[PDB]
Amino acid sequence: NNITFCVSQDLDVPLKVKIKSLEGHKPLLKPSQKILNPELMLIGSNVFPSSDLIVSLQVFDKERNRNLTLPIYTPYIPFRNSRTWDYWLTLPIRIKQLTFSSHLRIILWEYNGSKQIPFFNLETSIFNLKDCTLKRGFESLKFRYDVIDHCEVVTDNKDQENLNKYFQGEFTRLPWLDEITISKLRKQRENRTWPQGTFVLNLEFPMLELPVVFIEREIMNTNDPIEEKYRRLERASKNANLDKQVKPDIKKRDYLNKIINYPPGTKLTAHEKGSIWKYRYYLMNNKKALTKLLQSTNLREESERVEVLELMDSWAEIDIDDALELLGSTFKNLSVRSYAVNRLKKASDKELELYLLQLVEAVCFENLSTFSDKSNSEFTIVDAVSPLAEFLIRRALVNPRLGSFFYWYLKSESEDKPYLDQILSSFWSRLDKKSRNILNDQVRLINVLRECCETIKRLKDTTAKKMELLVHLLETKVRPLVKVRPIALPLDPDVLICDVCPETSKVFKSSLSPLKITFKTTLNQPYHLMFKVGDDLRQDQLVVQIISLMNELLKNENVDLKLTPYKILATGPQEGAIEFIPNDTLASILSKYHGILGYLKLHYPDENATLGVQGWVLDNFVKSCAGYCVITYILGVGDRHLDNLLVTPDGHFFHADFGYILGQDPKPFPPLMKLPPQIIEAFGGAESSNYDKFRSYCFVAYSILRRNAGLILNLFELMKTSNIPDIRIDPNGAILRVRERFNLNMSEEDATVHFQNLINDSVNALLPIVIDHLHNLAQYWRT
Amino acid sequence: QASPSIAIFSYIDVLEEVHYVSQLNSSRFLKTCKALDPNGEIVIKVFIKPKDQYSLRPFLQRIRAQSFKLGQLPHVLNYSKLIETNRAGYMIRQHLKNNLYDRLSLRPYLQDIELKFIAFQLLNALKDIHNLNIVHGDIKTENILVTSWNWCILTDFAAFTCYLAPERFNSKLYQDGKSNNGRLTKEMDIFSLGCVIAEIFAEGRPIFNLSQLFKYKSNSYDVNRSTDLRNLVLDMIQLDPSKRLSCDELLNKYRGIFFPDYFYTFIYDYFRNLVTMTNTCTNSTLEDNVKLLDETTEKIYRDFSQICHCLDFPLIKDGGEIGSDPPILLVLQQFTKVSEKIKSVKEECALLFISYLSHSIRSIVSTATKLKNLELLAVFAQFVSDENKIDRVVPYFVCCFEDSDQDVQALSLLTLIQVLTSVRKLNQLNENIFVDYLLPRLKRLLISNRQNTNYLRIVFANCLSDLAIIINRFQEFTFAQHCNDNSSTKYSAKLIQSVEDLTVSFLTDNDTYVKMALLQNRERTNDIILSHLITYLNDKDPALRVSLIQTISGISILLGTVTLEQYILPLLIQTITDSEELVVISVLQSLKSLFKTGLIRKKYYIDISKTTSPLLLHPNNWIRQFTLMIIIEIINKLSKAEVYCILYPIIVEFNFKSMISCCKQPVSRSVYNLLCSWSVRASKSLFWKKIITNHVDSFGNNRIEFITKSTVYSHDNKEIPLTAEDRNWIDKFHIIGLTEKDIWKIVALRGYVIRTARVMAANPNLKNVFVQLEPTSYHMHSPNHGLKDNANVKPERKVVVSNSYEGDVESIEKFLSTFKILPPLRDYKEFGPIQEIVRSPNMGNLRGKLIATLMENEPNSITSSAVSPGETPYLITGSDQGVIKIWNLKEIIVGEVYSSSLTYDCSSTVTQITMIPNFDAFAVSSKDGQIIVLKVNHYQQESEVKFLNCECIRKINLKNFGKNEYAVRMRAFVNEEKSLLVALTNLSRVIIFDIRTLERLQIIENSPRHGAVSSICIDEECCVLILGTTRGIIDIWDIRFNVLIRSWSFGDHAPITHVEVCQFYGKNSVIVVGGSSKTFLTIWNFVKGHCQYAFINSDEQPSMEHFLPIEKGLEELNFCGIRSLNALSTISVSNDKILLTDEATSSIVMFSLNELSSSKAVISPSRFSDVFIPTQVTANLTMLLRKMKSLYHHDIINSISTCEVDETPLLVACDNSGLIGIFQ
């Protein structure tokens, strides 16, 4: 055994005590039985029972007079043999659990007579004032009826015997003479005393090491209130006892309905949640009150989940637009995903446009997937290798184009999540028809084509040399295009490609080394395409899809902002492709053309006989300008500069490099509008008409957007929940910022008018302060 | 990052968390909230941009006011950091996220009658203090006051859509900006704003409106909503400046005389809370520390604070134990109850501060948090219906909260017990189903981590089952309360009936959990079922539970039969119908007779319990007819069980005869005479236990033969025949008396019972004996558990360790300061430097001619002679006249200068002296009782050495013993561990004084039967002392255990000259001159108990029987010495050579331990020398013989010392004539 100092929490298990000897009072039979005497006629008169002393042990707690430890009692031998046991006994409280405040206690219960057995009482302290528990050592005690205790004299000698156990400096011959000290401790039996009303007992509890004791540790985590406490009180107020459910109605029903009309991502209060809990009738009545009421309650126990899931199929079918709110990872409920899948069982053409968010849902589709993976591995343990997911599989097998979209979407997720790689094979197994698989392999050759482009990007040469080499590579690729059969087009799943024109192809002068090639389709028409590799286009691709969806939202308002929805997608992890467009640089259009007027008059010059006005080209240009301004304000797309902005001769304003967004700009954070000084001048001279019209289209687009903005908010919530480039924990603050730029908390549209006033300040500073003028000069210098 | 101190967000000017809310007004410019976070921990700040603020930046006065206001930490909220940087000028404050009004709406449960008045009082005190700070005018809004877990209101200077509180003065006096007037304000405006805000807090909605301002201009308002409160509010409301609001006057106008003092003590407690409420500003751990400390101090002060207002004598605390000490201070938790809600609140006590301290106790910074939550549960003593609900709701939350420590379950059980001690009728109809669900929640929380003990909680809840029935009675009380109306009595009755039918399922779940815990096996739950059986009265259900406990009693009769005993003893408390089961219980007693002796005592307890209330006379008559016959056992409990037979007979004449048939008492008359009968029934069960051993031996024997010369008696008939010859001799080995003729046929049934006890195990000249029991280990397993703890690897240190971190470990640090230290530090401290040991080869081979004779003091002999070793040995000799002399070795060697090189005056006769090992200090003791040590001082010059001065380092009087004893012999030693000295008293008592502290470590005393001390010697380990006896005995004692190891004697049994531990002989052998006359030196190995080598002067070999070790001899031996001149002598032994001065022929002799053959005398007579040689008679003992065959004149040698000159070895000697000489 080893001695060492070891603190409470540091020390591990529960205490135990061995107990051995006593002191015969000699006043009775040696068992302390019956109080023997020659006067025993009185012993028959007093009915004095013969008691055989036994023992019991339990600890008085802390001297706080509470009760903690366990009473325990052993078997019976002669107490006239003075019951020398050295018998160990224990209870269930560890030293880590043991409070340094604590005390031992013992009651000696004899066995006397009819309904009779005696009782004697004693108590003592557990640890030392030096915190060592009885010094983890042998001892001896004395006790009377009350207020008595133990000392050390001969027990101090015995304590020195415990110092032999306590490992004072020792040697081997000393150990043999410690056998001679077993003879000496044998000689120690000579002790004598004859007290009364009190008794002595020899009790050794030598351990290996000296304990120490303290309190338990703790954890402070995430002078303050906290979240879980509010949960405690709120949940304490959640009784709802008498089960009778009234069906009352009043003017407050309208206000409550307005309270249920709040945004999906919002976090409701306490009283509002309860008001929505008693609103179950009207909540079932209104289809827009479904998801809100679903988030108004928390499902943990089966009690709430009972009525919840019971009302799940009972309530009116919710709008599919509002169904995207409960389709997020925020609600992982099985019945929720089930019912939503039943509502999403119908797959429209907008589901193909929702495939981007469906990839996010696929990334978020895994929750406690160990069971499902084991279930699949159970059936995969037979043959060697050589849920809404079923709905997605059925939708993938239904239309070959949708399956190609799912595979193309899986190609990107294959890099981030390793399970997606096998999930692609599961998707191939999800589609029985191999008719689409052949064209999928023909489109899988595009990976080798991108590898060939990367091979062309591997060698470094002159600009013209790399151009001619790109032409030769375009010819070698033109051979394969004619050799291989027609495949699915990147621009649209419906259109099929035939071949590619070698001499019509071009090459980007940028650092990314993009490839521009005009490929003749099966419709016998040339189609320009610009592809890139060695980078993640997922940002600008998702932004492009969001631009197309928003364009659909605008088309739903029966008004077109004339914005060109540039097609963008990611082929491989590093590779991506995009539909090319007649785009010219802003700096090039400024320097060469000397103003945007001549460049716009290049394609379709219009000189009116009256005002010299321009037609639907300039109209679409202005609409595209205002629309791009609204998009830049809303989405908060950053890293947009003269280089990041392009001009499309079709009358469209092109914007690229969406990698930085959601309030992220390369330089210090600028205003919402992306409008520069040039467009501000061009629309500045025409302001009397053009600015009023652009403001009309502005406000109109604001109303249209903010009307349906909820679905886009939920979709963005799920998409951001999955994962994002250029954003990480941005996501919470990003959602927040989307709401702020949207100003959903304000019923006043005057914010757009304030932005218009800012656009008015863009031409000339208000000069409220010197730092304000310097700020305007800074914004002008930044441009 | 391109530039530091910037931010991602537009409005954000610096590093912080994400965005937040904001506001604006027609009164003032717009503002925005901000949050700066430390990776998930943020505060509540405000956005301000210093970059554009460089144009004005008049923040001086605002910063002074901010420093002054936030400097103090009153009940009102204080600003955290107000500052301006090169980028962000944003301000900051502590995290709140609770507005006053918003929390008033959010916390209807935390809102109370006296609570609002308390918060308003705190706001009044803060406002008055602010008015005393000569600063005011802060705009009052409902978002100013914030709340925390402490549920206290804290107002901030920044109160930022909501209705504004206008200042009537600044309003009515405003024309064109008051003619371009600068910043202005008064305490009056703060009084009016504070007024309106206070009303807004009172009602929950404010009075602020355009029409309200117009009405204020109309000098009239409609008052609708207490008298004094309305007047005091209207004072500030009417006209701020004109009507003289006077916040201080209202503070003195406070209604409650009690509430004022209580909230004064609560203001001090609020200062404590401020102490808890208190780049780099404040530490994160400082919050938790401030919390735990606030709680501990809160309770420690809650003793006397409770004593202040509305206390009670009895309590659960220490001071409460002192208060309950007067009122009589098994195991249960109980204290002063509520007593019908403080006797319907006779003292009108309503306090939410306790609930506030509990909500603050919701957190936990240590295990002191246990006592904190317990103190909150104690604070629950104030009885309020709605409050008790939330208080009890918190407890279960705490239960399910911390799975870290098991103490959480205990504290939760305590608070729950308090909730059971609440004793109040249900206020809300929800209290029924809420309790029904509360049970289910506790059931869900009942499932937890393994190895944790829920047993105590099980016994507690089972004991609270009666309280559950009382809760059903509370549901009946709710029904009775709902029956007070018209046409609602039958409705409430049917509702209570249906709720009872639904409660049957809850009772079913409870019984299910009970049966589950009972079936769990964790035997502590079985003991927890005792209290369950005690409180089982509330459950009137079937005997199925008792059947489960019966099967549990069988499975216990399998393994845990000791526990089966204790359970069965408690099982006698059933007291239930169907007495037919009591027969099976009697059979269970017969089954309890199987093995466990505790089961016998338990069955005796059940026997008395059954003796109290009987059932069937005849069955129990035959039962007791067998049992009383089996009650003749001599066991202490068996007698007690035997005494119940008389009590049974009480409940007549026919029974008297029937009992007289089996009666063993001829003289029996009554109960007392029955006691005399039992007194005559005295027997010994030891021979009965041995007989049981013979029964088990017979069970191990062959019973196969049924030959000679199944019913009840057939067992006995088969029992007797089992043995013939063996049982006969076994019967002859006992007392074999006429009283031992009792057959005790019940021992056969107990024999088959013990055969079942042996059936719980394997198959049961002669082989090894079979024990009836086996000992537990508990020893080596403890050390192995220490090895597992070593796998856990806590810390420890033998030597000094660095200062430990602050905490409860400070007791262990103080424990480290509770041990004496710096024993080694006393070595290098004083008394000069420390030399080293320089040795030399064997010096016995040299001729050893005397090259010097010098005597400084003719008059008397030297009492001691010693030498200080080194390159240049320092010679030292004492005097009988009490003089200390020191001579230089080399100086006497070369120049041969003969005088005292150093002289010290002791002024009194000196006893002895010794040189401290590896030191330059010389220790000396004097018969005046003067013990002192002199440090050496010397120098080295001119390629030589010289001495400077002699001074005593330490002075300790031996006369301080009190008996005036003179020091006999002294031996000192210094171990690298520690240094000390040992000396013999005038009464020859061993005393070891610590050289470090110059104090007595311990005192040893040789037995007076040994006469006096014949010598002094120290063990190699110096843990043992070797001392001779004047009685002619040898005694070695162990100072470790502080006792005498052994006492030896031999030879002629005369006095022992000297005793010492030889080098080559090791510590296992000791050299002792004494004992037998002819023998010069007797060397005996301590452990061997024999003398290995005895050097004797004689012409013949001694007797083997006489040379044998004497042990059995006792103290009765009369001392016989020798007066011859050959007796007294001196001897010194070192380096394998043992030198001895022979007084016989008056010559110096040298015995080499290597070869006694080559051994010879240094200086001898003129004519011839002596020839010596050894031999061995015994295998374990050898003996050396010396065969004998004059200018130098010197007296007997009183002292001698061996030395090395660093060139050639040599010896020095001092005689009894006061003469010294040297031989090289």
Residue numbers in the entry:
A (entry chain C): 4 to 225, 274 to 437, 479 to 875
B (entry chain B): 10 to 169, 194 to 258, 267 to 319, 327 to 377, 402 to 559, 570 to 603, 613 to 742, 750 to 807, ...
Paper passage:
Vps34, the primordial phosphatidylinositol 3-kinase (PtdIns3K) that phosphorylates the 3-OH of phosphatidylinositol to form phosphatidylinositol 3-phosphate (PtdIns3P), is conserved in all eukaryotes, and it is important both for endocytic traffic to lysosomes and vacuoles and for autophagy. This Vps34-Vps15 complex is the core for 2 larger, heterotetrameric assemblies known as complexes I and II. In addition to the Vps34-Vps15 core, complex I includes an accessory pair of proteins, Vps30/Atg6 (BECN1 in mammals) and Atg14 (ATG14 in mammals).
We determined a 28-Å resolution structure of the isolated Vps15-Vps34 heterodimer, which suggests that the structure of this heterodimeric core is similar to what is observed in complex II that does not bind Atg38. The low-resolution EM structure of the yeast Vps15-Vps34 subcomplex shows that the 2 components formed a stable core, and this assembly may also exist in mammalian cells.
